[PDB]
Design a protein around this ligand. Structure first.
Ligand SMILES: C=CCNc1nc(N)c(C(=O)c2ccccn2)s1
Length: 293
């Protein structure tokens, strides 16, 4: 921008490019996100987004400023050291130690529990927007409601469907906090196996990968599923696979927690608050990760 000196280009979110920037003024380093706007600017968005600035929690990346100047939209966020995606890729040979995987999940659930208790949903959780620092903390960033859902980035980028909840893929028009628990369950499994749980390359491939693993849902396990917008009676009928084949070598408390995070029925899916009381977290600690910056 003007009051900023773009150091580098962190990458690209679902709304626009993200830059690492130094505030010439204060000199403090931030993550600056340019939002893509050809047609009128949203009135509700800026107001709703501005409300997000009042969302403080150790596991939520602080939104420092919403700048609407020169009829452009910038979001200024506190800058974190690395994202979980790069960290997992960096830990692919050894894998993230269980104590650290457990600490990250525990913290992310606290972050979600806080956002959800405030009626704020993320809707697009993914390793790329989970950020960690040298002190072992992990925070949720790059939150969807305020500015609808873009079919593509401002410049043709392949949105990842790997973490999308089944009700969304089945065309549910209303989201619930349950969609965030599902995405986190998928990320949790991924840290454990060092491989994406459901790496779909299309909406239907995404849906069928979930079905082939958890079994094609029906009215018994998911009341109302057959009446969902994109449900087709012609969906193949896959049987549920043994869960011990899904996330080995995760212990039973972990598998029990994960299965509850991956329940088909949003209403049966465990909440973030309830998950925090799960016995899996009985021996939770806060290890410090080895970060290569
Ligand atoms: C990747 C580490 C650089 N530091 C960052 N610090 C942040 N606060 C970042 C983000 O909020 C973000 C969100 C979505 C996509 C890309 N970046 S990125």
């Amino acid at each position: 921008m003007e009051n900023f000196q773009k150091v580098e280009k962190i990458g690209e979110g679902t709304y626009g490019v993200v830059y690492k920037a130094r505030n010439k003024l204060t000199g403090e380093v931030v993550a600056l996100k340019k939002i893509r706007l050809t047609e009128g600017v949203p009135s509700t968005a800026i107001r709703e987004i501005s409300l997000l600035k009042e969302l403080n929690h150790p596991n939520i990346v602080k939104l420092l400023d919403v700048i609407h100047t020169e009829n452009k939209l910038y979001l200024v966020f506190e800058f974190l050291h690395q994202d979980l995606k790069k960290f997992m890729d960096a830990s692919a040979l050894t894998g993230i130690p269980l104590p650290l995987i457990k600490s990250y999940l525990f913290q992310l659930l606290q972050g979600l529990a806080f956002c959800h208790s405030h009626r704020v949903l993320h809707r697009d959780l993914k390793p790329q927007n989970l950020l960690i620092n040298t002190e072992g903390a992990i925070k949720l960033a790059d939150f969807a409601r305020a500015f609808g859902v873009p079919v593509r980035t401002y410049t043709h980028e392949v949105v990842t469907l790997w973490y999308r909840a089944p009700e969304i893929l089945l065309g549910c028009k209303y989201y619930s906090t349950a969609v965030d628990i599902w995405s986190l369950g998928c990320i949790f499994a991924e840290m454990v196996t060092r491989r994406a749980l459901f790496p779909g390359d299309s909406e239907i491939d995404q849906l069928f990968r979930i079905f082939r693993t958890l079994g094609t849902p029906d009215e018994v396990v998911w009341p109302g599923v057959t009446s969902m917008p994109d449900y087709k009676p012609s969906f193949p009928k896959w049987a549920r696979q043994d869960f011990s084949k899904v996330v080995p070598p995760l212990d039973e408390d972990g598998r029990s927690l994960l299965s509850q995070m991956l329940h088909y029925d949003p209403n049966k899916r465990i909440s973030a608050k309830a998950a925090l009381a799960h016995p899996f977290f009985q021996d939770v600690t806060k290890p410090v990760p080895h970060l290569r910056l």
